Amino acid sequence: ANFEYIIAEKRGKNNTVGLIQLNRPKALNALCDGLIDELNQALKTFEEDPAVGAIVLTGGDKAFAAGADIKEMQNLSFQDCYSSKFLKHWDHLTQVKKPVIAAVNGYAFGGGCELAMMCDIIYAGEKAQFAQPEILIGTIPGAGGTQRLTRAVGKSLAMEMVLTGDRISAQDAKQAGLVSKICPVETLVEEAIQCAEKIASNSKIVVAMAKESVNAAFEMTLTEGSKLEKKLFYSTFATDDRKEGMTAFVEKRKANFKDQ
Amino acid sequence: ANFEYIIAEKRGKNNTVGLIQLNRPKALNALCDGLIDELNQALKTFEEDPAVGAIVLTGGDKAFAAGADIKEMQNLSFQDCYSSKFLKHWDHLTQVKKPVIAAVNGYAFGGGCELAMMCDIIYAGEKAQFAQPEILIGTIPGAGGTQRLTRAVGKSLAMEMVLTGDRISAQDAKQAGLVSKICPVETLVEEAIQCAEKIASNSKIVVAMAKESVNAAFEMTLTEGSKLEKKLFYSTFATDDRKEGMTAFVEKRKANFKDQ
Amino acid sequence: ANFEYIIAEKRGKNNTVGLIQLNRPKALNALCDGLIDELNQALKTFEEDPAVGAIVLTGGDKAFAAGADIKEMQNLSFQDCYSSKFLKHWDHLTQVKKPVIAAVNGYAFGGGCELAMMCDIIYAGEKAQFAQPEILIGTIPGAGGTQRLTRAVGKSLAMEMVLTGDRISAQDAKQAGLVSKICPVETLVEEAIQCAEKIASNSKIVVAMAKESVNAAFEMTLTEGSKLEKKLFYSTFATDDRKEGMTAFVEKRKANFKDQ
Amino acid sequence: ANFEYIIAEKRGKNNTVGLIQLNRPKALNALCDGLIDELNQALKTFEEDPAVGAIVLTGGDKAFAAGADIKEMQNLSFQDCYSSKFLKHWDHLTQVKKPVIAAVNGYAFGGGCELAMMCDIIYAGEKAQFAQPEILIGTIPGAGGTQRLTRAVGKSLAMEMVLTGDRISAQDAKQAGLVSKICPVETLVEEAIQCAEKIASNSKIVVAMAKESVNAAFEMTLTEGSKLEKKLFYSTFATDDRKEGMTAFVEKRKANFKDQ
Amino acid sequence: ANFEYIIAEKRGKNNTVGLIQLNRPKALNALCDGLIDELNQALKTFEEDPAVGAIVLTGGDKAFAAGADIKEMQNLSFQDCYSSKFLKHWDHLTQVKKPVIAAVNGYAFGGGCELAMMCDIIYAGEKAQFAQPEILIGTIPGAGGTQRLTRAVGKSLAMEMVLTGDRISAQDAKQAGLVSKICPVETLVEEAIQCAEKIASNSKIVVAMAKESVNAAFEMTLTEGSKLEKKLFYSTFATDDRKEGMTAFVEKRKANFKDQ
Amino acid sequence: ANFEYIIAEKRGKNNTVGLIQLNRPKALNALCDGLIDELNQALKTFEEDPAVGAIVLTGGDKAFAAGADIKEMQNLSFQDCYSSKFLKHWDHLTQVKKPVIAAVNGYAFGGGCELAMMCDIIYAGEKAQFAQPEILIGTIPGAGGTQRLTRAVGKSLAMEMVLTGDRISAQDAKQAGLVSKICPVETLVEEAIQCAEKIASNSKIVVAMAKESVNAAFEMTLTEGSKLEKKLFYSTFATDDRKEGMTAFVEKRKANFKDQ
Numbered sequence A, B, C, D, E, F: 001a002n003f004e005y006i007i008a009e010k011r012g013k014n015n016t017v018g019l020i021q022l023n024r025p026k027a028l029n030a031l032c033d034g035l036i037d038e039l040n041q042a043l044k045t046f047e048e049d050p051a052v053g054a055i056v057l058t059g060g061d062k063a064f065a066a067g068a069d070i071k072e073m074q075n076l077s078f079q080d081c082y083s084s085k086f087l088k089h090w091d092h093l094t095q096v097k098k099p100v101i102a103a104v105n106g107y108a109f110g111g112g113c114e115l116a117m118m119c120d121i122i123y124a125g126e127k128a129q130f131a132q133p134e135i136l137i138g139t140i141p142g143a144g145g146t147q148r149l150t151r152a153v154g155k156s157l158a159m160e161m162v163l164t165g166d167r168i169s170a171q172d173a174k175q176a177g178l179v180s181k182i183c184p185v186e187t188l189v190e191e192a193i194q195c196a197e198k199i200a201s202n203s204k205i206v207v208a209m210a211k212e213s214v215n216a217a218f219e220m221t222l223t224e225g226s227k228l229e230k231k232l233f234y235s236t237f238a239t240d241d242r243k244e245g246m247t248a249f250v251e252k253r254k255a256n257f258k259d260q
């Protein structure tokens, strides 16, 4: 379309996967205001399309995202940030009911690591790096860089990456638990599209319920989490795809889900 | 005894280890109602026996448990699931004060992985695979498959395993935090019995207090957890086994605990 | 000062690192009342000094800390725990706003792993062993050996280490998420001092805000944690170090923070 | 039936209300093991009856319950109270999905106030008294006397009632929030039965979902509580009673629910 | 814009109060989709206006709001609600940073009480009635009717109002804690406008901070609530209104706040 | 002792009550640093005395406490508020294991209401007024004026008191849940001393455990709180005061507690 910083397109088989690529080779894909607004518009378009079942958010081959534009947040004060709700349009990815895959190739510093951790699945290349360099410019992460990273890779590693700003490899992120699969830099997007197609081959309402159940593991207790999980498991016996799946399991055949 | 789906026997030295083996190779150890009732009866028997200190739950050599029997809940609706307390007898592993060790050899999909995660120690074999294939039949896990899995392996890996139904190897569950030790297939049961003997060689009340203190790490905050742990530690100076152990450590000898 | 159980000195470049060494080779650095009081005094002195930006806590080359002194708690009862509260001065390390690095060489059993887990960054040697052998003396951990360890390495591994008393290696602790970097025994102190220098090379108020934001990940929920992180990010635009760092990032130059 | 401590009968219009009366005029309805077992059996019978929609738990005209029986717990030690779970049969009232009305007439001290607070609706008479006299015998409440009372009447009033053992009137309990309606002594049971009839006149599944939604306000946060409430509101559009009620609201007629 | 269901106008002296009046006497102010969209637009306009400091939400003299439009959600199924995010535009009131005052005169049943409880201050009239009639139509409250009500009036009164549908008076809501002041029907609007003027007579950033500090008392713990409150109290010494007010208090004069 | 801002003395029968009076008629008992240090020293002295069972904090007949001293915090900035941990000594009252009774006569504005709410039992006079007038000077409460007040009197009343600064009466605080008893101005001290005597007439360790169990109702969930209460009840069987009280109840005599 008329997007300036992102490239929106429908990739994959049968046009069931949405690919949002960050195209900004002049600032290492800086998360400016216009880029975030275009990303939110693309996410809304992909969430208002019954043909799309999964979204893949990727960047470039040398850098996924360099964070927020430091050259846009420099001449700001406390009143100009608190009475303008700075970085309020960055919590729109966590309100998406469709799965979002984060293909990370290259530098993922500052806002890039947060944007990747706000996704369901994090796929990184063989030459990917994750770090929190906010401490080097006199600030701290403010979009989920000290909450999800601490519960994902551990307290010690998160403390180190936040207080030192050191870069970790994809192997360290796989060992700790930040990423789920290491892929080559030239085939990461293809494997991400294949994973999004696997995901989009299932019932959309059941996928949304499963995503909510998994996300409810960081907001409540174990007992209440299991109770909400059992309630959502009870509330799925009233759909049409559950019975179809159980019938295709009993009788040896393929399951055709009707998204209902 | 008269068990139709399980094999209950007292194993280990001095008959201090309870072994519950699921024996039904005709459905890959389907978690039906009768099997769950027999498992609960065996757990109650092993909890009302002052000679058993630890329980070892195991399955077969090709499949630990293939989940709930889908050939029974196929003709169930929302009314037959909500006001019938479906799967209500599956929360008996979290109410047992004695440690339960899970020996996974083969396929542990859905209900098997849930029952494994509801145990304290998870021991898997080299030829073992863990997955949650609920998204392929039109439902979601409802017995702890989206809460205990996310807090162990990570958000990304849990999201992938839930939304794709893919199978992970024992090495992946070991490097992620789901399995604590990788063992051969032909020696997993013996090493699990040895671990249960090393557990049942200490004070039963102190072991139960330690189990409660460890399980309280997912039900509240860090400060409240530390305070409850300190209170449970203060509540140990009123028993005889703590004093016996301290005297044996000071005098450099062996401690004979009397479970009191 | 005139400390008999610890050695306090200002190490590092420009005397910006506080090295607290535990010198008790006769009891494997037993955590007695006097040693803990001296540790708290050293921590308060290093906290009330404007020239210290990070603290490095270490022990010996064969044992970091063998836990609490059993010779001072063997003849205690239940009434001697609520009244004249025991282990009440061990919660002075989690109240320090400056980063505390832990260098573990040798045995870290009981109270040693508990004091190491209360630190932000944990550095272990190639021949370091972490364990919670409280179940072998009739007691349970009482200073965070069942809350932070469970959330760090996982439920299964923590259950095993607590109910069996077995020792793990530095490689397993790094793979599970207990330590952040494995260093040689003869060069662990130098790398810890270098990490403390790299940490103290930034603004102290921003480092304290980052430490609090990371520590608030085990005391609140994800939604409330994100809002608290956004608040702490908004509350840094009123300082001079943030603007100095942003200017040094835009006008590419060395950043000189005034710790204000 | 054959109950020697309680009187179980089916009261109300069309035999839709269960009335459990504590009959022990010699011990002021002491909460012994036999009485609690009979109460649990009566609750199970009323929960396995499709004709009963609400339960009314009442006592006598001078005392509802005097608390735990002292003549059976005096010769008990720590190893006889922490083991075997003495207070494990008293939490069978919060696991009931049918509404339980607690008609409190007379003395409600110790375990009686807890048994009343473990119900949905608390009805008190004119000469009603609530107190926590456990502090006068050297113990503390252990069945919800310091958790629900603190969140119901306030911190200060609960602190006073726990640390002093003073008795409060029914008017003070109504002004604070302990009870919701003050009824005469001679007509308390009749008004409780009428309230139970008005409750049972609605769909049982909808009433159970509403009870779960209300009870989820003391175990979760407001943000996640609202999400669980919306999910349970979504999960009611698949039943017949919701459509029947909406049709009887649109067209001027009465709603006849089929409990499905 | 020109509204047909609500009346948006600037009231009070100096045009500092925004009054939203629900004008639908033909359906007792039914909370339909268009009415909620107009209410959200009016709230956004009043929140993006640098002259409005508080909002007063009111209805009519006989009914504030009769709840959600039942004549539009009757022909809805489980799929048409969970995959359409029904009632997703009703959480736009708890995201407003400016204080919202609710003036209830008449019937506030179902969605009316839910909309009133999402406001900071709740002002009711003499002939005002609050109830939850959702149980009489086959559904449950789904917009905060079982979470914000239970934590205000008590568990027993909330259970009664939810499972019986009974109507309470303004005196009961004042004695329980649902409303803050009882005012006449012909002067409730004027006193609400005066309260909004007294609220908007202070600094807007400090008012927003206090509102967030009070709202954080239901989403967090007391210990972390105190820490967040102390942080928000520290983060106010960098504004121009705090020092102005302190200087005016020291010099015994009036403080002229500039919202900065 | 030689206190210039407070008056410390032992009152009550047998010198079992510690009366701490705030004597500063020139500033309406301003909470300055010296006054807070003296209050903390007096609290520590009264908590380390085996002849003191309860503490009674009070002020004057015209004003209990006017809050923090504005004359020493006017020229403070964000750097002098985040650093040095300003107001860190105001959290020494919530760490006392002995009950603290608050006698409020006159004005209790700002810090006075916070110090009163940090106590267990709140006793106000007939001429007492509670308010949070921080919004009138440009700041917000920072010592529990927005966390305990919201849970005590409700959301609406707390919002009004914080955003308007209006003063409430003792009757409103009692009907809302802030205070527990209304007493005359000249006899409030005698009734508080009698309440402290009735509290100190029991076992100190059991009273401390009850206070902790009541305070754990604002930091944990309902299930976890009930479980911690049950654990404390089981631990109470390790002292002699419980057995003495039960024996005195069985043999119908007065119980003599020895705090062990």
Ligand SMILES: C/C=C/C(=O)SCCNC(=O)CCNC(=O)[C@H](O)C(C)(C)COP(=O)(O)OP(=O)(O)OC[C@H]1O[C@@H](n2cnc3c(N)ncnc32)[C@H](O)[C@@H]1OP(=O)(O)O
Residues within 6 Å of the ligand: A026, A027, A028, A030, A066, A067, A068, A069, A070, A071, A087, A107, A109, A110, A111, A112, A133, A134, A137, A139, A140, A141, A142, A143
């Ligand atoms: C809640 C959110 C919090 C935050 O995210 S705060 C910001 C956090 N991010 C950072 O602190 C670091 C951002 N980037 C860098 O430090 C470095 O770059 C790299 C480490 C990524 C390495 O890149 P290198 O090889 O050194 O080249 P280069 O010249 O510095 O970058 C090329 C162009 O990219 C612009 N750029 C890089 N990062 C940002 C950014 N965060 N905001 C705005 N622009 C950025 C640069 O300035 C420059 O542009 P020009 O040629 O015009 O000078």
Ligand SMILES: C/C=C/C(=O)SCCNC(=O)CCNC(=O)[C@H](O)C(C)(C)COP(=O)(O)OP(=O)(O)OC[C@H]1O[C@@H](n2cnc3c(N)ncnc32)[C@H](O)[C@@H]1OP(=O)(O)O
Residues within 6 Å of the ligand: B026, B027, B028, B030, B066, B067, B068, B069, B070, B071, B087, B107, B109, B110, B111, B133, B134, B137, B139, B140, B141, B142, B143
């Ligand atoms: C809260 C609870 C949630 C849940 O657990 S929902 C259910 C989730 N679990 C699953 O979806 C796994 C279902 N099982 C399978 O997908 C496959 O099977 C396996 C991958 C485990 C193995 O496949 P293969 O090696 O090809 O063997 P095979 O012939 O399909 O199974 C052999 C026999 O075992 C029956 N069986 C397997 N799983 C179940 C099951 N979950 N419920 C009932 N029966 C099952 C089969 O049907 C068949 O039996 P027959 O010969 O009579 O056709």
Ligand SMILES: C/C=C/C(=O)SCCNC(=O)CCNC(=O)[C@H](O)C(C)(C)COP(=O)(O)OP(=O)(O)OC[C@H]1O[C@@H](n2cnc3c(N)ncnc32)[C@H](O)[C@@H]1OP(=O)(O)O
Residues within 6 Å of the ligand: C026, C027, C028, C030, C066, C067, C068, C069, C070, C071, C087, C107, C109, C110, C111, C112, C133, C134, C137, C139, C140, C141, C142, C143
């Ligand atoms: C809140 C939680 C509190 C707790 O931590 S409870 C206690 C938990 N900690 C433990 O259980 C560890 C106890 N220590 C040991 O088990 C062993 O030691 C080692 C595993 C560390 C192996 O050390 P080895 O090579 O076998 O030599 P050695 O002779 O036992 O130790 C040398 C000296 O060190 C003293 N010592 C060791 N640990 C402690 C301790 N925890 N408290 C007091 N002293 C200790 C010993 O007794 C002995 O001293 P001497 O030669 O005078 O007899």
Ligand SMILES: C/C=C/C(=O)SCCNC(=O)CCNC(=O)[C@H](O)C(C)(C)COP(=O)(O)OP(=O)(O)OC[C@H]1O[C@@H](n2cnc3c(N)ncnc32)[C@H](O)[C@@H]1OP(=O)(O)O
Residues within 6 Å of the ligand: D026, D027, D028, D030, D066, D067, D068, D069, D070, D071, D087, D107, D109, D110, D111, D112, D132, D133, D134, D137, D140, D141, D142, D143
């Ligand atoms: C997890 C929960 C733990 C708990 O709840 S512990 C319970 C807390 N402690 C109490 O409730 C005891 C306090 N009760 C009393 O002091 C008095 O009772 C009353 C306040 C109820 C007033 O009744 P009055 O008639 O004045 O005294 P009376 O003569 O002792 O009562 C008549 C009969 O009732 C028996 N009884 C009273 N309370 C209990 C009880 N809590 N447990 C067992 N029996 C009780 C008595 O013993 C006696 O019977 P007999 O004289 O023939 O022996």
Ligand SMILES: C/C=C/C(=O)SCCNC(=O)CCNC(=O)[C@H](O)C(C)(C)COP(=O)(O)OP(=O)(O)OC[C@H]1O[C@@H](n2cnc3c(N)ncnc32)[C@H](O)[C@@H]1OP(=O)(O)O
Residues within 6 Å of the ligand: E026, E027, E028, E030, E066, E067, E068, E069, E070, E071, E087, E107, E109, E110, E111, E112, E133, E134, E137, E139, E140, E141, E142, E143
């Ligand atoms: C998350 C959301 C949850 C919910 O809110 S679900 C819905 C829950 N709310 C209710 O159930 C309230 C419904 N009960 C009533 O509406 C009763 O009535 C009253 C208690 C308010 C008594 O009012 P009365 O004096 O009997 O008059 P009248 O029957 O209401 O006629 C007035 C006109 O107002 C329409 N109306 C009233 N409430 C609603 C509504 N909630 N939705 C749609 N229309 C409503 C009526 O139908 C009728 O209209 P016409 O004259 O055209 O028949």
Ligand SMILES: C/C=C/C(=O)SCCNC(=O)CCNC(=O)[C@H](O)C(C)(C)COP(=O)(O)OP(=O)(O)OC[C@H]1O[C@@H](n2cnc3c(N)ncnc32)[C@H](O)[C@@H]1OP(=O)(O)O
Residues within 6 Å of the ligand: F026, F027, F028, F030, F066, F067, F068, F069, F070, F071, F087, F107, F109, F110, F111, F112, F133, F134, F136, F137, F139, F140, F141, F142, F143
């Ligand atoms: C985390 C905590 C945050 C906070 O607590 S902020 C402080 C509480 N916030 C407030 O805004 C409270 C202040 N408002 C007042 O203090 C009013 O006064 C009163 C309503 C309490 C009393 O009014 P009146 O009867 O007219 O007496 P008066 O002449 O103003 O006070 C007599 C002397 O007392 C000094 N004083 C009163 N409050 C404070 C205070 N909070 N800090 C310091 N001094 C105070 C005054 O200034 C004056 O003294 P002089 O005669 O020497 O001028």
Ligand SMILES: [Mg+2]
Residues within 6 Å of the ligand: A153, A175, A176, A177, B152, B153, B175, B176, B177, C153, C175, C176, C177
């Ligand atoms: Mg891990």
Ligand SMILES: [Mg+2]
Residues within 6 Å of the ligand: D153, D175, D176, D177, E152, E153, E175, E176, E177, F153, F175, F176, F177
């Ligand atoms: Mg109240």
